[PDB]
Amino acid sequence: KAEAFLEAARSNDTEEIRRLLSEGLDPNTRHRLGWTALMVAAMNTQHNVVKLLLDAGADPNLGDGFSSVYDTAREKSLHSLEVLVSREDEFSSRLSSRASFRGCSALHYAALADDLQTVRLLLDAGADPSLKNDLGHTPLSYARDGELSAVLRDAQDTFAEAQRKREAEERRKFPLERRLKEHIIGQEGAINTVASAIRRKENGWYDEEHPLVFLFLGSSGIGKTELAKQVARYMHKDIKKGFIRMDMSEFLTKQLKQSPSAVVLFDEVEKAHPDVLTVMLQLFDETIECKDAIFIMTSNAASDEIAQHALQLRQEAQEQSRRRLAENLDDVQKSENITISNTFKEQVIRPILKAHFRRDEFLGRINEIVYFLPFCHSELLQLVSRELHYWAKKAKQRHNITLLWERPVLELLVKGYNLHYGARSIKHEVERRVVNQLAAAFEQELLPKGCTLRLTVDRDAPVLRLELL
């Protein structure tokens, strides 16, 4: 029973804290009702045991498991009296909120106790001055106006500038990845996989045996191709030269000959003849006069199964994205951790790729498989947005016409997104539901030079119409 640990942590019984620490007792241990030793220690202003836990490696930015006397009385199904007596005796008697305390760091409590020194001790230990409890309150939200608020505020400023510079060096260190994220909506993890692969070869942690080889899986018209030509235009430092596309639905050297290190795409490889797959394979293993090229293939293979659970894929996407910004042998060991995309491919899709491909060999030659996911809402909104500023820009440069809209419009146009045609389904409707109107008006000379138009949504089938000002 480590009841003793927090009982000591509350009353600042330092020596018992030290003894139990030597016994392996975790410094980040909690009460039966959910508050860490550091929380009670910081709340009752026990600076000794606070520093003790803090240098002993106890994490400050942990959140309280306690919510309210009532709520916690329910979660554990107890009489409210028990919970009240517990929290008020064993934690603090100075807290008045009948609101929830769930998610409060020791810094929250430090601010609540109006104790500047325990605050400083926590801040020096890298406590987060912007961490939010389940009510969205920073420890600053709870800080009374005095010296403490300014310290917490400057802590927030520090953390902010840190974040800023972090973004700056993310931009310096992964420039290809930056331009990909800037010029491609959605498809986070895909960008990750590809860019990291290219860096991996260019640094020399891939075999020089063969130029890079990718396989793009998913749905047609959600980024694959423009991801390809984007990669090409970053690499060749030229929008045009550097790209080659082949149609496998149709079935070769001359085109390869003109540029020796270009980016090459093969689409709908589902039914490419083994004869060509064999020439494709031998060349990769390796007349061709081709080195340092990029080989990309696409297929709707396992598309149903990819889409079947893209939730997981995106989760791994932003989390593996978070590793890119962390720089210590620890996040790199976090990089060694078996990734969930590895598990998916093996037990779920490579057998399906093989049951479809017939080669247990072919998968190995390809450096990586890249997964493309169906757009979420925000990404669709961003596509509509993209096309809309395209035409607003063109209008402004050509006729000095300002073109405006709000979120309702975007939300409306998004409804006209159907899967089969993918991203261009938006390219279509904006051209139909808006550019038609623009050209119609301009024809009729209803759109004067230097005017201004607001795109409104009326409902009485919603109607989107122009309105001059």
DSSP class of residue 30 equals B
Euclidean distance between CA atoms 201 and 198, whole angstroms: 5
Domain 3-167 falls in which CATH fold? Answer: 1.25.40
Please give the distance of CA 258 from its chain centroid, rounded to a whole number: 39
Euclidean distance between CA atoms 354 and 234, whole angstroms: 33
Q: Give the Å distances, CA to CA, from 146 to 37, 142, 143, 149, 153.
A: 27, 12, 8, 6, 11
Q: Give the Å distances, CA to CA, from 262 to 84, 175, 196, 272.
A: 71, 19, 19, 21
Number of neighbours of residue 256 by Cβ within 10 angstroms: 17
Q: How was this structure determined?
A: X-ray
CATH code that applies to domain 377-468: 1.10.8.60
Q: Are strands 368-371 and 402-405 parallel, antiparallel or unpaired?
A: unpaired
DSSP class of residue 215 equals E
Range(s) of the chain covered by CATH 1.10.8.60: 377-468
Tokens describing residue 164 = 């800023």
Range(s) of the chain covered by CATH 1.25.40.20: 3-167
* Under 8 Å between Cβ of 260 and 236: no
- Contacts within 8 Å (CB) and 24+ apart, 153-161: 153/129, 155/123, 155/127, 155/129, 156/129, 156/130, 159/128, 159/129, 159/130
Q: Give the Å distances, CA to CA, from 232 to 225, 239, 245, 252, 294.
A: 11, 8, 11, 19, 9
Nearest in space to 199 (alpha carbons), one of 180, 184, 216 = 180
For helices 147-173 and 116-124, angle between their N-to-C axes, nearest 10 degrees: 10
H/E run at residue 251: none
CATH code that applies to domain 174-371: 3.40.50.300
H/E run at residue 371: strand 368-371
Euclidean distance between CA atoms 424 and 413, whole angstroms: 12
